[PDB]
Each structure stands twice: as C-alpha cells, then as structure tokens.
A paper describes a structure:
The 14-3-3σ protein, which has multiple interacting partners with specific peptidic motifs, was used as a case study. We have observed this phenomenon first-hand with human 14-3-3σ, a protein which has several hundred known interacting partners in the cell. Furthermore, different isoforms of the 14-3-3 protein are function-specific. For example, the 14-3-3σ isoform (but not other isoforms) specifically targets p53 and is associated with tumour suppression, making it invaluable to determine crystal structures of the target peptide with the correct isoform.
To address this problem, we present a combined co-crystallization and peptide-soaking approach to obtain crystals for any 14-3-3σ–peptide complex that may exhibit difficulties when crystallizing under our optimized ‘sigma’ conditions. The second step involves, after these 14-3-3σ–cJun-pS227 crystals are fully grown, displacement of the c-Jun peptide via addition of the desired peptide for the final structure at high concentration to the crystal drop and incubation for a period of time until full occupancy of the peptide is achieved. We have found useful criteria to be using the peptide at >95% purity and performing the soaking at 277 K with an incubation time of one week. To demonstrate the experimental reliability of the method, we considered this approach for peptides found in the PDB where co-crystal structures were published with isoforms of 14-3-3 other than the sigma isoform, since they were not able to crystallize under the standard ‘sigma’ conditions or any of the other hundreds of screening conditions tested. Not only does this significantly reduce the production time, but new 14-3-3–peptide structures that were previously not accessible with the 14-3-3σ isoform, despite screening hundreds of other different conditions, were now also able to be resolved. The new strategy that we present here has allowed the determination of several new structures of 14-3-3σ which had not previously been possible, illustrating the ease and success of the method. All models were determined to belong to the orthorhombic space group C2221 using Zanuda. In addition, the method retains the robust, stable, high-resolution and well diffracting features of crystals originally grown in the sigma screen.
Residue numbers in the entry:
A (entry chain B), B (entry chain B): 301 to 304
C (entry chain A), D (entry chain A): -4 to 71, 74 to 231
The structure:
Amino acid sequence: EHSL
Amino acid sequence: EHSL
Amino acid sequence: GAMGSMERASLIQKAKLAEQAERYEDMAAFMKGAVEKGEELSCEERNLLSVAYKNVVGGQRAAWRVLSSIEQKSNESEEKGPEVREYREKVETELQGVCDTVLGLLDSHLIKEAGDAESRVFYLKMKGDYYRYLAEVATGDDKKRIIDSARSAYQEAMDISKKEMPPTNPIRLGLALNFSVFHYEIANSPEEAISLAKTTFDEAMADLHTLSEDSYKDSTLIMQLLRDNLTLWT
Amino acid sequence: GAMGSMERASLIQKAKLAEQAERYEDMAAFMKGAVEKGEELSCEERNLLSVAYKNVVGGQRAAWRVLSSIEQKSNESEEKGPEVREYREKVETELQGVCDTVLGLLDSHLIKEAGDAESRVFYLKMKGDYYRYLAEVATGDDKKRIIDSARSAYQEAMDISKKEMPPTNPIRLGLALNFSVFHYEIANSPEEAISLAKTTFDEAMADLHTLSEDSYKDSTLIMQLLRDNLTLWT
Ligand SMILES: [Cl-]
Ligand SMILES: [Cl-]
Ligand SMILES: [Mg+2]
Ligand SMILES: [Mg+2]
Ligand SMILES: [Mg+2]
Ligand SMILES: [Mg+2]
Ligand SMILES: [Mg+2]
Ligand SMILES: [Mg+2]
Ligand SMILES: [Mg+2]
Ligand SMILES: [Mg+2]
C-alpha cells in the first residue's frame, strides 16, 4: 500500500 | 530460538 | 468495557508495553479503554491510538486481499464449495467491526472535543482513513455513501490544515498523502491524486528552509512518500 | 465448540486458507475443530495443526520474552508500579492457556489412537514441545514437574523413533533437534544436548546415501539446524  |  | 476498572495512566503504560511486544490487538484494547475515560488525548496518546488500530486493521486488510484474490480466481475453474467466500466474509466482517469501533471512538467524542488544529486534523484524517478501509471492501449502493463519508472527512481535514498549519507540517503532509491515495485507489480520480501529491510536495519543498534539522527530517520523510507515489503514477 | 457445526473437510480447507492469509489464530481454531471431530489426522493434517499452534504460541513466547526483559530491568531503578508485572502475567496466562489447549488435544485423544510410528512420534514430540514452552515460563516446584513431563514425552518419542525410523527420517531428526534444545535451554544439561545433536548428525550423515534427491533435501535441511546449534554451543 502507498499510504502513510 | 534454535528449535525446529 | 473490560478496561473500565483500569486507571487511565495504567492503560497508556500498558499500550506502550504492548507496542514493544508487538501485541497490537492488546494495544488497541488498551487505547480504546483510555479513550473511553472521556478525557482528551495528548499528541503522544493520539499516536498510540493510531499505531494500534493501524496495525490491527492492516493485518485484516492484508488477509482480506489474499482471500479475495483466491475467491476471484475460483470464479474464473473447479467448484470448491462455499468455504472461500465464507471465510473471506468472516475476515471482512471482522475488519468492518474494527473500522466501526474506530469510527465510533472518533464520534464519541474525540472529534467534537478537538479544538486545536493538530488534534482535529489528526482525528478527521483518521475518520477518512477508516471510511476508506470500509470502502475497499464495500460494493455498490453502500460503497457510494461510504466513499462520500471518507471524502467529506478528508476534505474538512484539508480545509483546516491549509488554514492553520504550515505546508511542511507532518500531519498536513500525511493527510494530503492519504487523501491522494483515496483519489487514486477509491474515487477513480488519478488526475486529482497526482495534482494533490504534486502541489503538496512543491509547497512543502518551498517551506523546508524554515525548519530545524529534526523537523526537516520529519517532513522530508513524508515528502519522499509523495514522490514515491508520483513515480508510480506518472 | 464453536466449530462443531462445520464439516471436517471445510475446517481443513479453511485452515489452509488461513495459513495463506497468515491468520494463524483462525488456523488453530479450525484445526482444533477438526481434531474434535474425533477422527485420526493424516500426515498433512498433523502438519497443519502443528504450523497453526507453533505460530500462535511463537508470537506469545516472543511477547513474553520482551515483557520479562522489561520486568527484570525494572527490578535492577524507578518503581513504575504493578503494570509491567500485570501485563507480563496476562500474556503468560494466555500462553499457558494455548499450551494447555494443545496438550488437551493430544490427550483427547490423538496420542492414544496413534499407532503408526510417524503419527505417534509426531504427537509425543509435540507433547514435549508444549510442556517445554510451559517450562520456559514456570518457576520452582511447578517447573520441576513440567520439566519431567517434557522429558518423559521426548524420551518416549525418541525410543520409538530409534526402533521404527531410519536415522534420516525428518520427524526423527526434528525430534532429536528439539530434545537437544530441551537439554540445553531447559534441563541445564548442555553436554547431553551436544552429545545428542552430534550423534544424531553423524548417524544421519551415514544414511544420506540411501535417499532420493527430495528426501536428501528434506533431511539435510534439519541436519543443518543441528550443525548450527553445535556451532553455537561448542
Ligand atoms: Cl469461516
Ligand atoms: Cl494487563
Ligand atoms: Mg483514575
Ligand atoms: Mg460482506
Ligand atoms: Mg491527465
Ligand atoms: Mg493542485
Ligand atoms: Mg460431516
Ligand atoms: Mg504466572
Ligand atoms: Mg564437556
Ligand atoms: Mg551420544
């Protein structure tokens, strides 16, 4: 995933 | 640990 | 609540121990107990709440993706019975339960009591994130309303952050990062995702000169995440 | 049991799905349900049972070690209250509960129905392992009896394995590996641990010429573990  |  | 008899300070202490032990379900239960004492959360306590539930839901999301992929392949194939769907549904329901728990804590009553920008933007951002996790597993006619709820929370957080925080503020940067992911992965708006990530990156770059070494490290770490996504998307 | 209404074959299928999803608590619950159907377990099913509970108790053991270390440092120091001890005790009790569950499955009635060497030695060896995990957290006057129970299970498994299996049999090799760890880490008998690991290694080496490529790979993998421990201990 590419979130924080 | 050193077990199986 | 099962934590109702434990001191707030003891719940916070045990959440920190649970983090060290990588016992994130315990950590989340301790932090839920602390929230339910009714007092506002400090900055450190907000981060403990977020770390706990992020790890719990992160494991559920990873498992749901594995099972959804197996289920989709099984519908391309030998009929293996209802078991794949049943078990994917079990994990999905548990995931939805955790998201509902987090959303309930934010609604009772973390957001309403949060008056400072750092707390209000943090909470929402969390509200946007957990509606986004609900959206990942939702299907039509419920998915639309869940998506709008995520969008609304992120938009309110953005509006506050742009008025009240510098463009290098790590909370503001992480909110923009996650709202851009929402646009790309949930809302079918890759151009909005790219525009948001680029404008956020560029405006932070121009403000780095104001920062100490430690703040510079904090901000550039999240800017690198924005850059990483722009590299993947463009 | 909560799995009493699910088909045995469905429980096994879902245990395999849970493994793929890294949902080991689910995997263990599914395999417990399968054991409680009352039928013997196949080789593949025994391995699913072992993988499930090994992962569950392995996480508990890792957490217990983190908390025990923090607790020991806290007694070298500022009084931080009862919380470290309380939480270490909570994890310890949960760990003991999982070990008791596994031991109960072996006693009701996996071992008594296990007549073939491969099944009986497998079960135990498991009985020795889970008494060994109980021993890791036990203190005096209970620790002695738990240690003897582990030793007794391992010794019966050894006696059968030496009579009924070739010295390269992977079950026999893994039993010897773990009994040697028992001697070194639990029973304060490092010389017995080293002797056992060395004799096991050497007798397997002399039997490798009888094996196919695939069996050779299976046996040498465990021999490398014996060698790794001998390197650390000598
Ligand atoms: Cl299920
Ligand atoms: Cl506790
Ligand atoms: Mg109080
Ligand atoms: Mg559903
Ligand atoms: Mg375009
Ligand atoms: Mg723009
Ligand atoms: Mg049946
Ligand atoms: Mg105890
Ligand atoms: Mg000696
Ligand atoms: Mg010897």
